[PDB]
């Protein structure tokens, strides 16, 4: 037992609204690892809040798509 936590950030694009991206944070939550998710859409980032030995950015980019959404990394 132990499972870390840690946030990332990153930007989006490709949306209708600030809501919809709510949806795909929450929904991306009920992937392995992830514990927490928050859509900082008031400064146009999202916030992930899971365990990166377990997760990741795998699950996330994979439901990202399927979620109908696209990320962006401007900070690697
Ligand atoms: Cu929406």
């Given at each position: 037992m132990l499972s870390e936590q840690k946030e990332?950030?990153?930007?989006?694009?490709?949306?209708?609204?600030?809501?919809?991206?709510?949806?795909?944070?929450?929904?991306?939550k009920?992937m392995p690892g992830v514990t927490d998710?928050?859509?900082?859409?008031?400064?146009?980032?999202?916030?992930?809040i899971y365990d990166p030995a377990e997760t990741g950015?795998?699950?996330?980019?994979?439901?990202?798509?399927?979620?109908?959404?696209?990320?962006?990394?401007?900070?690697?």
């Amino acid at each position: 037992m132990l499972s870390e936590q840690k946030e990332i950030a990153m930007q989006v694009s490709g949306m209708t609204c600030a809501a919809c991206a709510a949806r795909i944070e929450k929904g991306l939550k009920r992937m392995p690892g992830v514990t927490d998710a928050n859509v900082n859409l008031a400064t146009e980032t999202v916030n992930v809040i899971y365990d990166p030995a377990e997760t990741g950015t795998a699950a996330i980019q994979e439901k990202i798509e399927k979620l109908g959404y696209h990320v962006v990394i401007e900070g690697r």
